[PDB]
Design a protein around this ligand. Structure first.
Ligand code: NA
Length: 16
């Protein structure tokens, strides 16, 4: 998988 970053607070490093 690959890391995807987004904002929701927190800056989140999600593994997709
Ligand atoms: Na939000």
């Amino acid at each position: 998988a690959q890391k995807l970053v987004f904002f929701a607070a927190a800056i989140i490093g999600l593994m997709v």
